[PDB]
Amino acid sequence: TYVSLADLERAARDVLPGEIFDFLAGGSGTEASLVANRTALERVFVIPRMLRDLTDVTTEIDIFGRRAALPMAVAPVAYQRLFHPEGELAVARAARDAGVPYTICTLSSVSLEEIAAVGGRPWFQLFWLRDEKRSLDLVRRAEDAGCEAIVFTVDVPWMGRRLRDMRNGFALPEWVTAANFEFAPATWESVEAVRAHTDLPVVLKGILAVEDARRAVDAGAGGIVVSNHGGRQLDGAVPGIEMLGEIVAAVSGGCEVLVDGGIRSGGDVLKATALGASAVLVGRPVMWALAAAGQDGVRQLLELLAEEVRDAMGLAGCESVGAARRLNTKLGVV
Amino acid sequence: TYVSLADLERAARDVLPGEIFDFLAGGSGTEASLVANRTALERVFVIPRMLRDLTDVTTEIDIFGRRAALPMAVAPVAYQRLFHPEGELAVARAARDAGVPYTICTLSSVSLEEIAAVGGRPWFQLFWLRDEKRSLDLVRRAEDAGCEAIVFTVDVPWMGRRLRDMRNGFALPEWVTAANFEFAPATWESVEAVRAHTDLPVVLKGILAVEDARRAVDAGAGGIVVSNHGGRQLDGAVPGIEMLGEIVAAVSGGCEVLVDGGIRSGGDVLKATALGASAVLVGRPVMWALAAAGQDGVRQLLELLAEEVRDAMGLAGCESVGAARRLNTKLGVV
Amino acid sequence: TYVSLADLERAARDVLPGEIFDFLAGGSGTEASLVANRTALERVFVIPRMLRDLTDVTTEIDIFGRRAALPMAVAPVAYQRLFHPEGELAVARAARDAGVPYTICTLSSVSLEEIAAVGGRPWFQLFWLRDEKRSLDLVRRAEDAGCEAIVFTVDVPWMGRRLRDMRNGFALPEWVTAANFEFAPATWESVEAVRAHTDLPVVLKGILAVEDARRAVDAGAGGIVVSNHGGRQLDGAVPGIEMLGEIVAAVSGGCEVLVDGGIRSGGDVLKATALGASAVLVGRPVMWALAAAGQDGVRQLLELLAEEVRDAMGLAGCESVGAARRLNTKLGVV
Amino acid sequence: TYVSLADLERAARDVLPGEIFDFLAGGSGTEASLVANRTALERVFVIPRMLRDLTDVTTEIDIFGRRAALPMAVAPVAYQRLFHPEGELAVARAARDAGVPYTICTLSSVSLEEIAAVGGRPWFQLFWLRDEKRSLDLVRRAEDAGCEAIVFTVDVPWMGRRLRDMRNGFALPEWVTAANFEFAPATWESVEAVRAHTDLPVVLKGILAVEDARRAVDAGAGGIVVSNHGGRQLDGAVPGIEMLGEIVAAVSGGCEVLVDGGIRSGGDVLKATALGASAVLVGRPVMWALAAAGQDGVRQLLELLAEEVRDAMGLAGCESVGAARRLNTKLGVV
Numbered sequence A, B, C, D: 001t002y003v004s005l006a007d008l009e010r011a012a013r014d015v016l017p018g019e020i021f022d023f024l025a026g027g028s029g030t031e032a033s034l035v036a037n038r039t040a041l042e043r044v045f046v047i048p049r050m051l052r053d054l055t056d057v058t059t060e061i062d063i064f065g066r067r068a069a070l071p072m073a074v075a076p077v078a079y080q081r082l083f084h085p086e087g088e089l090a091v092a093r094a095a096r097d098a099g100v101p102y103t104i105c106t107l108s109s110v111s112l113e114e115i116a117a118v119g120g121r122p123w124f125q126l127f128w129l130r131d132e133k134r135s136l137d138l139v140r141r142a143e144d145a146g147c148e149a150i151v152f153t154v155d156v157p158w159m160g161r162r163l164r165d166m167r168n169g170f171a172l173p174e175w176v177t178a179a180n181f182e183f184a185p186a187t188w189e190s191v192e193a194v195r196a197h198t199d200l201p202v203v204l205k206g207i208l209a210v211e212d213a214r215r216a217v218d219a220g221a222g223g224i225v226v227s228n229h230g231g232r233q234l235d236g237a238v239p240g241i242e243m244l245g246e247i248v249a250a251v252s253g254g255c256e257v258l259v260d261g262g263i264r265s266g267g268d269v270l271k272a273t274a275l276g277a278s279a280v281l282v283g284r285p286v287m288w289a290l291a292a293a294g295q296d297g298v299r300q301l302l303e304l305l306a307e308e309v310r311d312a313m314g315l316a317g318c319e320s321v322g323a324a325r326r327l328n329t330k331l332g333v334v
């Protein structure tokens, strides 16, 4: 039985080959931004409210035209067959059963149409490719397969410097491939080409500057993910959680504002929502659960997160996610 | 001989079964709010005054119509027979003899009428129950038994996630019961029902938001306890000591403002009073003393705390608790 | 050869009996204020000036009508025969030869007249006693013996709670006595009685509140020492170095403003002067040198401190102590 | 293969004699300013921009009339034959081949004319000497040999207190000499004498006070290096990186503003440029590479730094160094 997300990390570290654990856990450079994602959340404290009606606490949200069971989605994580033989299918089935959106990756190790066929109203994460037409074909494939949003990753003009992977000489095993089939820097022109090619909401993942959040709204984005890519891209990039409040104020409801990086409990979800997030993404912990126990492991993680989110909301006096967004916070020292 | 409260923790850890020590020591979740209660006090420094008349230093206060020997009461702690066979009776006798109020718990392991019969003008802590009538009957029982204040706990719509207890599989031994005999979320309506049912002062324990402190005064509370429940409820809730000054300013004398969480010396009592508290509650250390040496252990703890409070007040130039409330503080780094 | 003051602490720890080392090193309570004296200095960084004339760097100051070779005096430390058989005489001889004022203590283990006969224009530290007439007789004795200033300690209405001493059961050996022969709280009336009884400058040692520094000037003090008594009195009292700049601004040249607590190098002297101190006191390191090597040890400490002060001043562009007081500082993180 | 600058430090520590490693690694006093150079950079986080054109990312700058391949130069480091038998010639050849300026030192262990003959448009670092005419002759020698800038070190009126060197009894081996052949405090008059004696840009290295940066522009300096001399001069001097933004604002383009101290990656270069630096100097890491592998080691270090600078710039949305200077930063906690 798992009682915290950290139990799942310990389980995944036991089972996975070291170099695959390092691919999953690592960040770029000195890993300063990886560590800072955790430090930044640890410094945030919630000011809970008391004595409110909790007859019908609900953790549901409406986002991108669908009800979701929690203010959370599974982050895009490439090559999930690295962690378990059922890879993306195991995670997508558990997310569907939990009512949580799952983000299908451009670098999925099972084709996007197979994962979409699991059901659950999934999203699709796009990398812009040197061949533009391939990127736009991926968007059309995702839409035709029933994906509900395009999560355009805007912080990977190229992959960051992953020193653990370099030191391990890590490469994909022969049995893991990019099943949808290189990176080209995306620009605002690329965003507009995607927006013109689809009716789905376009969500820009990897925004940290306030001006880029404003420009995303002006560009017609339906959402942004405030994110430093889990500390895997620019080493020294500010954590998303440290930019979130300023960004939420600047867009002033013009798009959904998600955040990711280091969310490791329902209490962390509560902190993100109190700082103004519409929802969070969760990356590494979902893969820990997949490595530890496959689909059932992911189901147990999502049940644990749902319990922790409900617990934290009610302890803070919030019968709905909207009420949680109106909580105040205080920075402290750890 | 004990020369600090930390000597009592070491003694209690030696004697108690591990799972009972963990029930006592633990907090919710990652224990971030438990640790932060200590960090927050450690960052506060007092600016002492010199050269004042200390002919007649007194640590007494008047609160809820009674003189108390120190600006301190024993916090409500459930199930004290877990720590010593005399449980609540041992603690209540020592508190009476020291002139300190003792808070009888709804979850006491000796009935509230037995503990009240010890004397000492006790308080009574109320949990709101699914059966409302049971809660209101408890209030009437407490009043009929001579309790002087109703300490309504407002931060437990349900118990937080106590991971040590889950991991230990902790349960009450067969020989410990709730001797007054489930939780229902309390609301402001519950507060009003209690206020209408009693002539005693109603004290809301577990307030952290400034607006909830203001509303408590408007609701007719005679006091509040600024508290995160010793880090046992919302993991990530701000420490009470970090909200205390703002709350004292907002209520501007409209009710007594107590604080708890991490008070471990007379110097900590002085810090709380300099931040504006009327009095503190002390929880875990009283149980350490009870575990270590029963009634005599509690007596020794209260004598040590009285000596440390007198010492700190006089070293800071304060002949009375009111003067201590006018001290200034400075945040520092530890 | 000693190249830092920390070499002397290591040497003194080797030679002294543990309980005497603990009497010297210890503070009150949890030792939070003892540690904070060091943390507070470590957080201060100097902004040095370049390209100034350093033809004739001088570390001298004029204070209380005498030239001193450094902006430093030996702090009052009781019972110096605990550390070396020559006790106060060894320290006073080395201070005289270095041109540094030495503070003779009320609790000296050699009589104040013997120590004054060493020469060197000494100061005299006064404790107010239950028998007032004894305190005023001490002042007259000190003046008749040629002491140049009365350092009235205002932060010891009684001794703080020295837990190391309690735990060690420390007591003075039979061969160490208060050779000038209990504490009574001093008040502003006591200050005025001393000021009326002597022509010497009265320096109030142990001021931390800005208002008490202002009142000291109004009371006719010639100086104050901004100090928490080396963390030995109120545990949780702010470090003097954290109050110094505010106090220097409030008195606006109306008296000399000294500081002590944790000065462990010439660079620390420079930080204190850049924060506005007229001079520092140094306590524990002088006793380390005395324990390690007697008079010659103290001489070596004072020569090392003089070299470090000259080095730091010149590296910061300061040909005089007055120029060092005009340096700016920046708080940083350690 | 080296994947970070820290790999080179480990390699250099293996090969060098301990006392030479300590000469290289050490700082003055307690090494507080040495450590603070790293802490200060670790606290700075970059706010990267996304979706910008990265077709032609260039790391080049124009400085002192020459194009440089990176916003970096090799800092002046005395006596490079201590680290490798080819000393300065090995480093200068690698810097030339990488397109990076190399600063020839007054205390070079190979004559300045030999090092200049390597090519690469070098700079020359000047110490002011007791015999002024020797300093001015050095300037003329450097100019006649083709050096492009005079880097006048203004923070060494004398050498700081290097406790590692004292404790090791470090001295130059007989086979290392000052091949160009004592310190005199330099003043603003010395700066003017140099400016009058040369047509080359004069760069004042070791400025930390804002007023001294302003005065440097007024004095006709072409640049300054904001620097605490790698923590080797005043122990307790603020890190240059903590003064850089204020200094850049005060000079408001009147001279080039470089910074040094603790630059250990391309990400650190990016932080310095986002705080407004025109370029950085790098000291110790260049010597680590020289010790580890001679000229080829330096080449590998400079190739690694070039890759990290390009990577960090592009990940932050910057196609040029000028764009990197317009990035914003946020202080965080580590």
Ligand SMILES: Cc1cc2nc3c(=O)[nH]c(=O)nc-3n(C[C@H](O)[C@H](O)[C@H](O)COP(=O)(O)O)c2cc1C
Residues within 6 Å of the ligand: A023, A024, A025, A037, A075, A076, A077, A078, A105, A106, A107, A125, A153, A205, A227, A228, A229, A230, A232, A260, A261, A262, A263, A281, A282, A283, A284, A285
């Ligand atoms: C192993 C791994 C692979 C990832 N692959 C992608 C990817 O292909 N596309 C993308 O937009 N983000 C990718 N991410 C970033 C995540 O979507 C997410 O931003 C980061 O992991 C969130 O932080 P968390 O892992 O701390 O929860 C990846 C993360 C990891 C750990």
Ligand SMILES: Cc1cc2nc3c(=O)[nH]c(=O)nc-3n(C[C@H](O)[C@H](O)[C@H](O)COP(=O)(O)O)c2cc1C
Residues within 6 Å of the ligand: B023, B024, B025, B037, B075, B076, B077, B078, B105, B106, B107, B125, B153, B205, B227, B228, B229, B230, B232, B260, B261, B262, B263, B281, B282, B283, B284, B285
């Ligand atoms: C073992 C334990 C049981 C407690 N039971 C109750 C309770 O029944 N009702 C309540 O209002 N608080 C309860 N508390 C909270 C305390 O009253 C108090 O808020 C917290 O312990 C104060 O902090 P301290 O222990 O750091 O002094 C309990 C605390 C502990 C440690």
Ligand SMILES: Cc1cc2nc3c(=O)[nH]c(=O)nc-3n(C[C@H](O)[C@H](O)[C@H](O)COP(=O)(O)O)c2cc1C
Residues within 6 Å of the ligand: C023, C024, C025, C037, C075, C076, C077, C078, C105, C106, C107, C125, C153, C205, C227, C228, C229, C230, C232, C260, C261, C262, C263, C281, C282, C283, C284, C285
């Ligand atoms: C062992 C010891 C004894 C002291 N005795 C006295 C005293 O009799 N009177 C007094 O005013 N201060 C006394 N002090 C305080 C010092 O004068 C000084 O304020 C404190 O030691 C300064 O800090 P430092 O030791 O960190 O340099 C004593 C300090 C120590 C360590």
Ligand SMILES: Cc1cc2nc3c(=O)[nH]c(=O)nc-3n(C[C@H](O)[C@H](O)[C@H](O)COP(=O)(O)O)c2cc1C
Residues within 6 Å of the ligand: D023, D024, D025, D037, D075, D076, D077, D078, D105, D106, D107, D125, D153, D205, D227, D228, D229, D230, D232, D260, D261, D262, D263, D281, D282, D283, D284, D285
């Ligand atoms: C061993 C050593 C010798 C140095 N010699 C000189 C020197 O002769 N002249 C000078 O201006 N700076 C000298 N410096 C300072 C460097 O130019 C530079 O300011 C400092 O090393 C920069 O920091 P970094 O080493 O952290 O990169 C020296 C530094 C070291 C480590």
Ligand SMILES: O=C(O)C(O)(O)C(F)(F)F
Residues within 6 Å of the ligand: A078, A107, A156, A158, A159, A160, A229, A232
């Ligand atoms: O973080 C990852 O591993 C990634 O997002 O898939 C990549 F490789 F594109 F950068």
Ligand SMILES: O=C(O)C(O)(O)C(F)(F)F
Residues within 6 Å of the ligand: B078, B107, B156, B158, B159, B160, B229, B232
């Ligand atoms: O902290 C406790 O253990 C408590 O307050 O008694 C409970 F259980 F109600 F939450």
Ligand SMILES: O=C(O)C(O)(O)C(F)(F)F
Residues within 6 Å of the ligand: C078, C107, C156, C158, C159, C160, C229, C232
């Ligand atoms: O700090 C000391 O030991 C003292 O100042 O001498 C005392 F005892 F008076 F408090």
Ligand SMILES: O=C(O)C(O)(O)C(F)(F)F
Residues within 6 Å of the ligand: D078, D107, D156, D158, D159, D160, D229, D232
């Ligand atoms: O830091 C150095 O070692 C130096 O700059 O060369 C010196 F010696 F001049 F101070």
